[PDB]
Amino acid sequence: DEWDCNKGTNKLYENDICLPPRRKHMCTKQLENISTASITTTDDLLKEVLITAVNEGKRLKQQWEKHFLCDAMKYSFADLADIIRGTDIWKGNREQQKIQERLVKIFRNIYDNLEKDEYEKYKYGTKYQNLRSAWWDAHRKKIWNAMTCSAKEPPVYDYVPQILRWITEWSEHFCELQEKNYYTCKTKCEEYSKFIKKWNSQYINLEKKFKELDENLIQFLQNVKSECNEPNTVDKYLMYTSDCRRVKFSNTID
Amino acid sequence: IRVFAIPPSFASIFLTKSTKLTCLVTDLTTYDSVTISWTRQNGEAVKTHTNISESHPNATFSAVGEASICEDDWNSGERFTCTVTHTDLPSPLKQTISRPKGVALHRPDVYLLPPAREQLNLRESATITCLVTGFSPADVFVQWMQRGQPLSPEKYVTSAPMPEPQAPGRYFAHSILTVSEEEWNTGETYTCVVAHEALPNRVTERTVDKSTGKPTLYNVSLVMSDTA
Amino acid sequence: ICEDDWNSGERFTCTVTHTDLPSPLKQTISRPKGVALHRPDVYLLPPAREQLNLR
Amino acid sequence: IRVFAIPPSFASIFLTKSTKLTCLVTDLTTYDSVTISWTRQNGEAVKTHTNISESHPNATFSAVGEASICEDDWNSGERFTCTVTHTDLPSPLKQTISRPKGVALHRPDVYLLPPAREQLNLRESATITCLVTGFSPADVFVQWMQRGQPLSPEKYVTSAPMPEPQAPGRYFAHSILTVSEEEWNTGETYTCVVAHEALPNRVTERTVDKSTGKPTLYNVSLVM
Ligand SMILES: *[C@@H]1O[C@H](CO)[C@@H](O)[C@H](O)[C@H]1NC(C)=O
Ligand SMILES: *[C@@H]1O[C@H](CO)[C@@H](O)[C@H](O)[C@H]1NC(C)=O
């Protein structure tokens, strides 16, 4: 349940973001161990993605049995969407570089075996991510159906940029664990002091980069500023289900 | 009334993968019985104006035709005829275009340049420049490719061929592209494809990377002492 | 012929007549279809160290 | 009538160490009273020929023979004659085959090239070349050895000898060994073995791993 927010190799870029634990220890071995020689068509690529979705679903099902499962599975689907779409952040991981190095082969072969009325539309781009996103949006409905076999409508958080979603898992996890914290008192008191200080600077470091309100990140921020009547807020007011903005977060023990 | 016809250049042929011809009429509004046709110098009608362009409201008619089948014949320099005929005009108006001859065909010599250290230190954005130079005909089309895919034409900017002072017949040009600092510290490859008439293969590629410029030796002589 | 005719796949037929042949022999050809496409990946390699020692 | 005799080469006499012969007759009657035998130049009869192939359904005839011979007897120059006689064609046929003699002799120079950095960067597989060159008799057998156990034949190919551009009589060849990139990172030695007559011994061996090719970098010098 540690987020490992120090730089290390968690994120290449110098800005500090705290990686969720759900990103770490995923069953990405199916796409990791792909053979670009044996696969050159869209139909064969869909099946393995469906298999990976099934493995992720059963992994989460086994992990939880060691609505909350639905939320975690929702954000895991969004994370896998970002992995397939090629806009993921975790470039520092040596394992995750190979996946984004060998999906290029598959989608280059797909772009090579295309026809003229789509060749001119998908000719220009960078790292083939335009037709990668097109392929995802074409086959997005089937993947979640295979994922939801373990234990409808297509999820919408997959279009949300990853950093704000990471904020949402942080909010859910912290409210869950502070509910877990409490429900003589001298024995319990000293752990809460260490409970605050293990995550004390975890809130402040991200707040310094909430300014300047990536290329696609800014447009979503501008559009959401027009609605919800709260353009500039350090708290998103999405699924917080508790008090926010430092009200009971810090020094609540006394 | 006036009709202007311009021939396609190497950039249009390379990008469109076909030969497109224009026989465009200026200062002529919409009337009836307007005839435009591109015919062979020998006399036969090689191609008609199928899917004729709609007249522009401001006294302009496009009337473009495609000589797609005869790619080499345009390069041969054979003369083309446009037949413009209207009821008011007694004598049909003709437009003639052909490939020029006699110009020199000196080859380009591209040299791709890595970004400066001062720009890299500020950690904002690196600008890789592609100094195409030496070509005798003034027609160059430059694209940028990353991992076998042409980059969008928004990210790079190409300057027009400028005359070179040292030699009369030769010219030069340049282009830039704004790579992010992260994507260049990662060490990716960028290619500057140049398309020109004088190249025997008619295309040339060059590559740059983070490893393109590095020093070799680091001879250091630490001479720590205690007595001066 | 122009390359645009050949790559479009327009079927062409060959006509040959001879006194020996009671009937003309005709052969047809077109660009093969149904194949797959893949791009080469050139890796230019440098010479071995040992060979340069022989100079 | 067509009677073909295939003399043995280094592949047959060295891969299995048995200088088998063969009588391959083709384009004749499918079913006929067939005589298949080999005869030495002196005239003694060879041993039995077993497992003659059945008639090829395309009206062509097929026959298989084997004649074990002494190894240096084939080198001794004894001309061997395959006997073919049919009732359809009453004329018997005897065809003489012998190894070429008088050809020049030259030693192979095996060089082994490590994979390029870009190929490793693709993170799929590394292909290792084995550049046999400079051998005149235009025959060679190339096999790959990993850690001293034989390697699967499916994991490599070999080109036929082709004339050297700047040598009138010599030849060269090629062989790629598609090793997995992960197996190359955890250092495992691969090596070539070249089979050729002109070597002082039968075979010559060369090997390259990541340790080979790395030059000196750190000239740390301490001065009193
Ligand atoms: C490098 O420095 C050493 C002294 O530290 C000097 O002797 C040597 O000549 C230098 N290298 C070159 C190439 O000049
Ligand atoms: C390494 O240092 C020694 C010290 O004397 C010198 O002689 C030699 O040339 C150096 N070699 C290289 C490759 O720098």
Side-chain angles (χ1 to χ4, degrees):
Chain A
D1 290 356
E2 59 269 14
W3 282 54
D4 192 0
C5 191
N6 192 358
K7 181 188 77 173
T9 187
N10 306 320
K11 172 181 152 273
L12 181 68
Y13 182 76
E14 75 263 10
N15 270 329
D16 291 331
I17 193 66
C18 305
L19 292 190
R22 200 197 73 254
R23 180 72 165 91
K24 195 178 182 183
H25 294 89
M26 261 195 298
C27 54
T28 62
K29 303 295 183 291
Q30 209 301 317
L31 321 183
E32 157 52 46
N33 283 318
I34 210 172
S35 60
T36 75
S38 59
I39 189 155
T40 181
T41 187
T42 63
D43 206 304
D44 291 331
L45 183 63
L46 183 63
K47 300 190 293 181
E48 293 179 353
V49 171
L50 301 153
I51 297 169
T52 307
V54 176
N55 296 115
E56 193 68 29
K58 54 213 303 183
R59 172 203 177 280
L60 274 296
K61 162 83 186 50
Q62 173 184 0
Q63 173 54 350
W64 268 126
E65 300 318 283
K66 213 73 180 282
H67 189 193
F68 63 92
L69 192 138
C70 294
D71 312 327
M73 183 177 177
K74 193 85 152 63
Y75 293 102
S76 181
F77 173 54
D79 189 24
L80 163 59
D82 214 318
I83 297 169
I84 300 299
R85 207 182 301 156
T87 65
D88 211 359
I89 295 93
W90 197 5
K91 187 258 168 186
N93 190 210
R94 174 42 31 71
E95 192 210 12
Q96 298 270 295
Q97 174 175 356
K98 203 197 299 180
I99 305 174
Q100 306 295 331
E101 198 64 29
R102 61 184 47 186
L103 272 295
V104 175
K105 294 322 310 283
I106 324 296
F107 274 114
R108 183 163 103 223
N109 279 333
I110 298 303
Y111 151 80
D112 290 328
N113 284 322
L114 275 191
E115 55 272 27
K116 282 291 308 190
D117 53 353
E118 277 155 341
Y119 192 84
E120 308 278 350
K121 191 169 85 170
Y122 295 112
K123 174 174 168 59
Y124 283 128
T126 175
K127 277 164 65 179
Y128 310 112
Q129 53 204 130
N130 45 8
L131 74 163
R132 205 180 298 185
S133 65
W135 174 89
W136 170 268
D137 291 305
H139 302 127
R140 55 186 316 282
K141 187 60 193 75
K142 315 263 209 303
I143 297 172
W144 200 78
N145 286 135
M147 185 180 288
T148 194
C149 80
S150 167
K152 296 180 74 68
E153 73 274 12
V156 297
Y157 293 101
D158 56 355
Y159 320 94
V160 179
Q162 189 93 347
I163 299 169
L164 276 76
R165 261 184 290 100
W166 279 347
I167 301 299
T168 60
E169 293 85 4
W170 191 328
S171 72
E172 278 282 333
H173 187 193
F174 198 50
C175 79
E176 282 295 308
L177 60 90
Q178 65 85 30
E179 190 70 31
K180 177 154 211 173
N181 273 119
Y182 204 84
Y183 205 77
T184 53
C185 200
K186 294 296 290 183
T187 306
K188 298 294 293 296
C189 75
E190 74 265 18
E191 283 75 17
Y192 285 103
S193 164
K194 305 319 154 206
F195 150 71
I196 295 299
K197 70 175 317 163
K198 60 93 176 179
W199 268 19
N200 50 2
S201 70
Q202 284 267 318
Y203 189 71
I204 62 170
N205 54 359
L206 314 183
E207 283 322 302
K208 80 171 162 283
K209 203 42 197 171
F210 212 69
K211 65 211 170 63
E212 203 65 31
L213 301 169
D214 203 13
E215 281 86 309
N216 51 15
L217 179 56
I218 52 175
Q219 284 97 26
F220 181 71
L221 263 183
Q222 286 161 358
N223 274 47
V224 71
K225 265 200 166 185
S226 62
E227 271 305 356
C228 293
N229 211 56
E230 281 319 302
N232 191 3
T233 46
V234 298
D235 47 353
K236 303 317 279 207
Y237 297 102
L238 272 73
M239 295 298 102
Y240 282 174
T241 198
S242 184
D243 303 86
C244 187
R245 175 290 191 191
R246 296 295 86 193
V247 168
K248 265 82 71 174
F249 293 100
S250 290
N251 207 0
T252 306
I253 301 99
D254 200 358
Chain B
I1 296 97
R2 274 77 49 85
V3 180
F4 298 148
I6 61 170
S9 186
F10 203 95
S12 296
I13 296 166
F14 187 39
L15 166 61
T16 60
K17 223 62 181 173
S18 72
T19 315
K20 284 312 201 223
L21 308 166
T22 72
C23 187
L24 190 145
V25 189
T26 58
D27 215 18
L28 205 64
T29 61
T30 65
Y31 323 110
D32 50 352
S33 178
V34 187
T35 302
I36 302 104
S37 166
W38 279 103
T39 76
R40 180 71 272 173
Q41 184 171 3
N42 296 319
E44 67 263 17
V46 289
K47 185 58 185 64
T48 80
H49 286 272
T50 60
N51 193 3
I52 195 55
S53 168
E54 190 45 60
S55 164
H56 192 264
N58 264 28
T60 300
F61 205 77
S62 309
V64 300
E66 48 263 39
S68 309
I69 60 170
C70 45
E71 287 286 326
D72 186 74
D73 291 331
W74 200 107
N75 300 120
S76 71
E78 213 75 25
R79 183 179 63 83
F80 274 32
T81 63
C82 184
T83 66
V84 179
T85 303
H86 204 270
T87 317
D88 55 290
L89 60 85
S91 67
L93 184 55
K94 307 298 287 294
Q95 287 287 346
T96 56
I97 54 169
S98 65
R99 184 181 251 290
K101 270 80 68 178
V103 292
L105 280 75
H106 299 258
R107 304 191 321 81
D109 279 322
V110 294
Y111 310 112
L112 188 60
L113 297 182
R117 315 164 219 140
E118 305 89 324
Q119 185 181 10
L120 286 174
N121 183 33
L122 315 182
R123 194 220 41 71
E124 207 65 46
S125 288
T127 56
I128 315 167
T129 186
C130 185
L131 196 80
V132 192
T133 185
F135 44 88
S136 176
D139 61 357
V140 176
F141 192 62
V142 165
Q143 304 154 230
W144 290 71
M145 281 145 58
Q146 176 176 350
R147 284 196 201 177
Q149 184 184 9
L151 273 180
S152 187
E154 294 324 283
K155 289 184 176 66
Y156 60 98
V157 164
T158 311
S159 174
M162 295 298 102
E164 170 173 309
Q166 293 82 197
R170 322 292 213 89
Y171 301 73
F172 72 94
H174 40 86
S175 176
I176 71 162
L177 192 154
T178 61
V179 297
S180 180
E181 174 267 350
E182 190 207 310
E183 282 192 332
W184 198 76
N185 263 359
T186 308
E188 307 219 356
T189 42
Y190 295 106
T191 60
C192 188
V193 294
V194 55
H196 186 236
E197 285 181 336
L199 284 167
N201 185 347
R202 313 168 104 75
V203 65
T204 300
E205 306 211 8
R206 296 293 170 95
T207 307
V208 68
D209 188 20
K210 175 43 171 213
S211 312
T212 303
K214 293 190 290 185
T216 60
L217 278 80
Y218 291 168
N219 48 349
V220 63
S221 291
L222 202 158
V223 181
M224 185 180 288
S225 302
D226 193 296
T227 64
Chain C
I1 61 181
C2 81
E3 191 157 1
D4 184 42
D5 291 331
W6 180 218
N7 64 7
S8 63
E10 182 144 340
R11 194 171 321 81
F12 309 132
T13 53
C14 175
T15 59
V16 172
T17 58
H18 194 32
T19 62
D20 197 311
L21 281 177
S23 163
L25 276 177
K26 266 179 52 201
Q27 292 282 308
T28 185
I29 198 64
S30 176
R31 184 177 179 179
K33 299 288 95 176
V35 292
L37 280 191
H38 286 102
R39 323 190 310 101
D41 301 85
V42 178
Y43 312 121
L44 196 148
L45 294 160
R49 184 211 281 131
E50 305 88 350
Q51 196 185 3
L52 307 170
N53 299 117
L54 270 75
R55 323 161 81 73
Chain D
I1 184 167
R2 287 150 46 151
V3 167
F4 294 120
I6 301 105
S9 305
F10 266 94
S12 44
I13 65 187
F14 182 76
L15 179 51
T16 59
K17 303 286 200 174
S18 312
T19 184
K20 284 292 131 193
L21 285 168
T22 184
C23 280
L24 174 73
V25 63
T26 316
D27 287 333
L28 280 184
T29 314
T30 68
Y31 291 165
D32 189 75
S33 73
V34 62
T35 304
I36 300 148
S37 194
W38 277 97
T39 300
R40 278 164 206 76
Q41 180 58 75
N42 195 5
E44 312 104 311
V46 309
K47 304 309 293 303
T48 186
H49 319 260
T50 318
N51 201 356
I52 296 90
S53 282
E54 204 261 328
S55 299
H56 173 207
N58 297 152
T60 73
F61 188 70
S62 47
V64 166
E66 61 272 16
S68 170
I69 301 299
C70 189
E71 294 289 331
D72 55 13
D73 186 74
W74 163 238
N75 278 113
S76 306
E78 261 286 289
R79 273 141 291 284
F80 289 178
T81 47
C82 182
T83 62
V84 172
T85 297
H86 295 105
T87 54
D88 294 328
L89 192 58
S91 313
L93 187 51
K94 304 284 283 292
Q95 293 188 175
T96 73
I97 57 158
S98 179
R99 64 171 300 101
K101 314 152 211 63
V103 291
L105 295 175
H106 282 97
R107 201 192 92 79
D109 311 329
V110 177
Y111 304 119
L112 193 149
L113 312 178
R117 193 211 37 192
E118 309 99 306
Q119 181 173 184
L120 292 174
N121 275 356
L122 273 296
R123 297 281 281 259
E124 287 326 302
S125 295
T127 60
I128 299 169
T129 55
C130 203
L131 194 67
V132 194
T133 185
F135 63 102
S136 161
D139 81 16
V140 65
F141 161 75
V142 172
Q143 189 190 2
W144 287 79
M145 211 45 88
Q146 174 190 3
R147 274 231 181 91
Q149 313 84 300
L151 210 52
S152 311
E154 319 163 14
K155 264 172 38 181
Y156 49 82
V157 301
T158 310
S159 158
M162 305 178 72
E164 185 145 71
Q166 295 298 109
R170 267 157 296 284
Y171 296 86
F172 68 92
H174 282 102
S175 186
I176 65 166
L177 191 84
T178 65
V179 298
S180 185
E181 190 273 332
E182 171 56 340
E183 313 306 278
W184 171 271
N185 271 333
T186 62
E188 293 179 353
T189 55
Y190 302 90
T191 186
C192 290
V193 292
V194 55
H196 192 256
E197 57 87 24
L199 291 174
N201 195 350
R202 293 211 78 82
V203 301
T204 293
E205 183 178 1
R206 303 281 184 103
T207 176
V208 175
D209 200 316
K210 294 187 290 293
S211 159
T212 303
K214 282 190 174 181
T216 45
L217 308 183
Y218 301 161
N219 200 319
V220 191
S221 172
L222 318 171
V223 181
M224 295 296 172

